Amino acid sequence: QLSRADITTVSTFIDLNITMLEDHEFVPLEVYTRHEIKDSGLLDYTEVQR
Amino acid sequence: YNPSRVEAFHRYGTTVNCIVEEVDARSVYPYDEFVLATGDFVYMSPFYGY
Ligand SMILES: *[C@@H]1O[C@H](CO)[C@@H](O)[C@H](O)[C@H]1NC(C)=O
């Protein structure tokens, strides 16, 4: 009696590798926050009047 | 009102016009002060009271 792995084996199937799409996490990103846009002005009427 | 016309003389004429208006007040956090529609600042919390 001999084991099943003692004889050479050939794959009769046509392998098809399937790599699922990895999960992705999106982080917040802004070129200019609303605070930066407000600060872009040279003068602010609110602060000047205050 | 202005003074009556008297030759080569300076005159002072006072005018007092009572005015009452309904203005929209605005305030921001910490709400320690508020502004008026006329652009005048009021350094008092809108909720101040006894
Ligand atoms: C992936 O597919 C290939 C054939 O494209 C196959 O040879 C391989 O054993 C498969 N599995 C792994 C883990 O690479």
PDB file of N, CA, C and O in Angstrom, chain A residues 45-46 49-50, chain B residues 33 39 41 43:
ATOM      1  N   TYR A  45     -13.981  93.599   7.902  1.00  0.00           N
ATOM      2  CA  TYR A  45     -14.822  94.666   8.432  1.00  0.00           C
ATOM      3  C   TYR A  45     -15.288  94.361   9.848  1.00  0.00           C
ATOM      4  O   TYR A  45     -15.434  95.276  10.665  1.00  0.00           O
ATOM      5  N   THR A  46     -15.532  93.087  10.157  1.00  0.00           N
ATOM      6  CA  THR A  46     -15.988  92.715  11.494  1.00  0.00           C
ATOM      7  C   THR A  46     -14.929  93.024  12.546  1.00  0.00           C
ATOM      8  O   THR A  46     -15.205  93.690  13.550  1.00  0.00           O
ATOM      9  N   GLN A  49     -14.110  96.910  12.813  1.00  0.00           N
ATOM     10  CA  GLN A  49     -15.132  97.662  13.533  1.00  0.00           C
ATOM     11  C   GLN A  49     -15.128  97.318  15.017  1.00  0.00           C
ATOM     12  O   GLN A  49     -15.339  98.193  15.864  1.00  0.00           O
ATOM     13  N   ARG A  50     -14.893  96.046  15.352  1.00  0.00           N
ATOM     14  CA  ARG A  50     -14.878  95.654  16.759  1.00  0.00           C
ATOM     15  C   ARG A  50     -13.758  96.359  17.513  1.00  0.00           C
ATOM     16  O   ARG A  50     -13.962  96.841  18.632  1.00  0.00           O
TER      17      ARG A  50
ATOM     18  N   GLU B  33     -21.267  89.329  22.861  1.00  0.00           N
ATOM     19  CA  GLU B  33     -21.530  90.647  22.304  1.00  0.00           C
ATOM     20  C   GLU B  33     -22.325  90.462  21.024  1.00  0.00           C
ATOM     21  O   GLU B  33     -22.371  89.367  20.454  1.00  0.00           O
ATOM     22  N   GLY B  39     -24.239  98.523  11.873  1.00  0.00           N
ATOM     23  CA  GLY B  39     -22.813  98.319  12.018  1.00  0.00           C
ATOM     24  C   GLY B  39     -22.246  98.704  13.366  1.00  0.00           C
ATOM     25  O   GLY B  39     -21.020  98.690  13.527  1.00  0.00           O
ATOM     26  N   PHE B  41     -21.381  98.094  17.252  1.00  0.00           N
ATOM     27  CA  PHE B  41     -21.150  96.975  18.150  1.00  0.00           C
ATOM     28  C   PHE B  41     -21.713  97.270  19.534  1.00  0.00           C
ATOM     29  O   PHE B  41     -21.675  98.406  20.014  1.00  0.00           O
ATOM     30  N   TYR B  43     -21.189  95.714  23.233  1.00  0.00           N
ATOM     31  CA  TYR B  43     -20.394  94.822  24.074  1.00  0.00           C
ATOM     32  C   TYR B  43     -21.162  94.362  25.307  1.00  0.00           C
ATOM     33  O   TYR B  43     -20.872  94.731  26.442  1.00  0.00           O
TER      34      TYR B  43
END
